[PDB]
Ligand SMILES: [Cu+2]
């Protein structure tokens with residue numbers, strides 16, 4: 001096949017993407033070895049769904065797992081009556097998700113399970129796939145003429161031909177695997193044919209962070225989780241926390257081989273040690289550096305000029321409320337809290353009004369990084385750690401290091417009950433989630 | 440007695456004001472005629488209670504009326520567990536109100552019934568009295584050397600030696616009386632002995648407005664409902680709506696007699712007419728002018744200089760929520776609404792957080808003036824009708840003419856359930872009231 005492995009794409013046809021997927025244990029070849037993973041559509045990652053605004057999506061999920069499951073349409077501003085975080089599809093049963101893709105939407109989104117208490121092992125085992133919303137902006141020459149690829153960043157650990165089981169320490173830290181893969185491949189080679197690449201990036205890992213850097217090159221950020229920036233932003237590196245997406249332009253500068261790496265990053269994961277009268281928690285420290293892929297530049301690369309503008313960011317109404325959500329940890333118990341409470345599906349934590357804007361100040365009073373995710377209602381990050389964000393774009397996950405406060409501008413869109421939670425999915429399963437009702 | 444009648448004063452003693460009042464039908468002489476009014480303490484108005492910050496008040500109210508009653512400590516930022524708008528004292532029974540006067544407080548406040556559905560006839564019949572909180576500011580020379588008086592502005596109508604009964608039109612408009620009295624006296628004479636007067640003003644009427652003007656003189660506003668201004672404000676006239684208080688300095692300019700008048704004012708009260716195929720509501724138009732009192736200046740008056748400053752207004756924390764409360768009318772039904780609902784004592788309408796600040800936008804979409812009152816939590820009026828307020832001071836009633844929006848900064852103080860309502864008390868009795876819970 002193509003030197004660069006990417007998930008198969010399923011496109012809407014005549015404004016309709018109608019598809020039946022099965023969630024199923026699937027024997028496959030992965031990183032040179034045979035394993036049984038849990039997959040959608042028989043593959044890992046699952047198929048990439050590619051749609052346009054105003055398309056109808058009709059996705060029937062058949063559950064062929066031995067446990068209940070469901071889907072979260074991560075990042076899509078649709079109704080929580082469709083993207084329903086409380087729905088359970090029992091083993092052997094099916095459910096049809098039907099929705100219209102919002103008019104004002106573009107970017108890279110994804111789908112994965114969200115059945116509380118069961119997310120981490122299901123996601124770890126291979127249940128996820130991408131969803132791309134094509135825009136009219138894709139037709140501008142500076143993007144149209146770029147070579148486009150999706151990079152699904154997901155790690156894995158195998159034991160006895162199956163995903164490794166979660167240990168108690170995994171529930172505390174979030175589970176990371178030794179196989180650090182791109183599109184289910186181990187360090188693939190991307191032999192570029194054009195001098196400008198457009199890369200859609202997805203961190204679909206349970207807990208691993210990717211401090212992205214391409215050797216000898218900057219990256220040009222053109223989209224965040226949920227939409228385009230207003231103009232490209234040059235960065236020397238780009239941190240993607242679990243659940244985050246980004247799109248970047250890469251402008252290949254000369255011929256040669258360039259490593260795309262996940263540089264060392266310390267997200268505050270913990271180990272245990274015993275030093276003569278101890279048995280206490282110790283920092284694992286930064287991750288070991290990983291090579292994600294080999295990028296081979298073409299001969300005599302002459303990249304396109306960058307687009308001067310992308311999408312103007314909407315002018316939001318003045319906010320009508322400020323919320324404060326404080327994240328804390330009980331590491332030895334592997335329990336995680338928002339405002340001193342663990343998740344309770346019966347309890348409503350925040351009640352807001354549709355079509356108003358809120359300011360949410362989310363504060364991490366723990367020692368680990370926590371990537372905070374809100375369903376249904378994409379937000380604008382104003383600042384984090386007291387530092388203003390250098391761009392305007394829609395996001396739906398925001399990373400907070402220890403001690404940091406993020407200030408978010410949150411327009412409330414669809415009515416109904418939905419959730420917010422840490423996207424280190426083990427932490428969500430272990431209680432770090434709350435309920436927002438919009439009326 | 441003194442040419443100028445003022446209610447008897449009861450003062451705290453050794454930091455304690457301990458007093459038993461009875462609410463009782465009382466034969467008395469009023470405006471030259473004999474009548475039976477409902478009174479506290481056997482008088483109309485009831486006695487003026489005079490206290491200092493940190494005093495203890497212990498007031499036992501004995502109900503000798505044929506209906507239940509209670510007290511509202513109008514304007515006092517105390518607990519709604521004491522100033523309890525839901526408490527009922529049955530006929531023949533007693534209740535003791537005990538509270539400490541807040542440290543940071545000064546001004547003219549008052550007490551009257553607040554038993555929903557029964558306020559208007561009880562207040563109209565004569566149940567009210569003043570409460571004055573003395574401050575250290577009263578010792579400044581420019582105030583100490585002024586001649587001080589309380590003016591309780593309250594009208595009355597008599598029928599068969601008793602307060603006139605409410606008609607259906609009274610429930611629609613709020614009841615006004617033909618006897619327009621000051622301290623229960625008909626057009627008293629105030630023979631000033633000093634050139635500077637300090638007048639504490641209270642509108643304790645059900646519904647009558649007083650567009651105050653002293654002939655040939657401006658007034659110097661030094662306090663609003665719930666505290667001092669930051670410095671005196673010169674005004675040519677001063678409108679006091681039902682429930683409002685003000686304190687003014689008057690600087691007598693020359694010898695002579697000067698009328699203090701209630702000038703014509705149209706608050707939007709309605710009548711009915713039939714003109715050949717009608718039977719429909721017609722504006723009553725402005726009130727007829729009234730003389731409130733005769734002010735006689737002393738010989739060769741040389742008033743004191745005005746104080747340069749009074750009390751700095753507190754710097755409030757940034758607000759965390761904005762509320763919108765819309766007032767509407769159904770005049771022919773004599774029903775009045777807040778956000779489309781009438782009062783229900785079981786229903787909580789707003790839930791806020793103690794020690795935070797809120798912005799309340801109160802909008803009058805009716806045609807009558809409505810004076811909006813909030814219990815427990817004094818507010819700063821920022822603007823009304825889109826016009827910035829010309830001073831900073833604590834208020835607890837704000838008048839809105841037809842169409843006007845008031846923007847208020849509302850620090851939430853004591854925890855508990857309390858109410859907000861129109862202080863045209865007929866409108867409150869007829870539903871224009873809601874419930875705020877502070878937690
Ligand atoms: Cu997700």
Ligand SMILES: [Cu+2]
Pocket residue numbers: 336369370371422423424427428432
């Ligand atoms: Cu977390």
Ligand SMILES: [Cu+2]
Pocket residue numbers: 072085114373375419421
């Ligand atoms: Cu979620």
Ligand SMILES: [Cu+2]
Pocket residue numbers: 511513551682862
């Ligand atoms: Cu009152």
Ligand SMILES: [Cu+2]
Pocket residue numbers: 775808809810861862863866867871
């Ligand atoms: Cu009213």
Ligand SMILES: [Cu+2]
Pocket residue numbers: 511524553812814858860
């Ligand atoms: Cu009241």
